[PDB]
Amino acid sequence: TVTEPVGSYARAERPQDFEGFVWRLDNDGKEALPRNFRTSADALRAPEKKFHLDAAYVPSREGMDALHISGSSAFTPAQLKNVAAKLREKTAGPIYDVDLRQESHGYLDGIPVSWYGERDWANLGKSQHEALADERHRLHAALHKTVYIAPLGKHKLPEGGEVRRVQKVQTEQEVAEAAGMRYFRIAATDHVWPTPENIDRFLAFYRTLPQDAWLHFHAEAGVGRTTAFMVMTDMLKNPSVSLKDILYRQHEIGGFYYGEFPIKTKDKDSWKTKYYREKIVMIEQFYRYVQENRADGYQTPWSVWLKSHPAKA
């Protein structure tokens, strides 16, 4: 008997050791667009050296022009309006803000904030319902109260920031709707592979989409969770493209590289090592799920298939 299967390593961590303690500033609002903004229509750039890839390899762009997805970090309401306008130039279909954040977040006086616990794991272990209830309660409790909002600096701890008495509170759903985007939430934990529940939820949602839907994915930084769902969408929509091409091209338009690479973390971040290894293994397993289940139209969900076809370290 195995306590936690591959793909579920985070279930072994204790939520009580990462409880939220500060309203973290998610974006300072200085730039017109959020960080790491990219779309599937973008030109491929040279790969980042840390992934030790072949800079001479040219991945297939088959299906990219029709993929219709984008990704970014968190944003201020003004930045999201800029994103929405930019994306409307590319499609006449519904544009979705696909919020991948498990952490409670929202807007206080229009400032994007999140209730941050160590490793951004303040809602670790909570069901999506419980995470969203926490978020609603916390945002409502901030109205007309004094809050401390701060960017994280040295040691991933607050440094500087501002103190204000809040006059307006909004959820991201409200901000997305104000920007003209549809909204869909998947509560995925920062830094780790999305859970079978997260992925089943995404696949059920994907199946409901009209042909011309545009998906704008984001979490906090626009790297791990954001690229994971962009990669899964590319695999689902372009199943004839090789795994190597999908991973190279999603990295080369500005995302994380989800293939094998020599992992090296700073000593203070050594806890991340096994989670990067787990993601590499799980990306391969998701590709296998798509290849094995697309012909019959996915009559068995990812969670069930993964239980009978466990991933191996």
Place this chain on the structure above:
Amino acid sequence: QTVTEPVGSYARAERPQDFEGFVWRLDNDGKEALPRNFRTSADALRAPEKKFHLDAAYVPSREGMDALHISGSSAFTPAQLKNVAAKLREKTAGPIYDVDLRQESHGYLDGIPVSWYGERDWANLGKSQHEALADERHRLHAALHKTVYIAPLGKHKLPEGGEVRRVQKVQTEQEVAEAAGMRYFRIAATDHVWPTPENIDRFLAFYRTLPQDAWLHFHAEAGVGRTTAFMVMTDMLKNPSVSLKDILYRQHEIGGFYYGEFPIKTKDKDSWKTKYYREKIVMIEQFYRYVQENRADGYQTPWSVWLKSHPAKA
């Protein structure tokens, strides 16, 4: 005709809702054996600080200092208070009081001294002492078994670094004082401003019933403004024959603030403090007058009552 706020009460014009608490501030890092600015009335006088533009050649009278029996300091960890108590016990066989002058809610989380800090350290501004202590009791209790962020203030008087911990023990300063072998007395005085008539009436009633050999250890957060104000008050009350100049010079020269006139200079960001420094200078003078004019009948008239009939002038 009607004056909204008299001299001595300027802080009543400030709006409490603009300075609400937002972080557990680290009050002392615990690295030294004693709290900062620790001094006693038995100490030798040192040269005055240049910023006060005093006469370095002046030799203040030490009349009554040997029997004064008071000390002052900044906030402290429990270990530091035990070291203070041991040092004071070498100087007296009477009861030693921890006279906590802090209006801000504070206490100890896992033995770490913290305070609920709002801008200007005014998180309990405008509250009665009853309300301030109720806030403190509730906040300390609510921290038990919960995760808290404790941080020192750095650039811009805002949190910088610090630590995050799940609290396993909570204590009030009263508990910490009793564990150190000291009696405890609380006066909820607001940081940076002249103590209120309510604060001073409370102190005078307390002073009147003290045993002859009581030793009073005063402290607030830094061991400067409120700490020195009450040390000066006590010196004046106990040694009424000593001149105002001697009291102010000597309390400054053993390590306290200088409460007489001086060239007030503030950084632009601290310009709000200017009028409060001026107010403290005139109120120190007014308190000296109260002591001189009310000692003969044994202070039958409370300070608050006397001050309303003899208001200070700006």
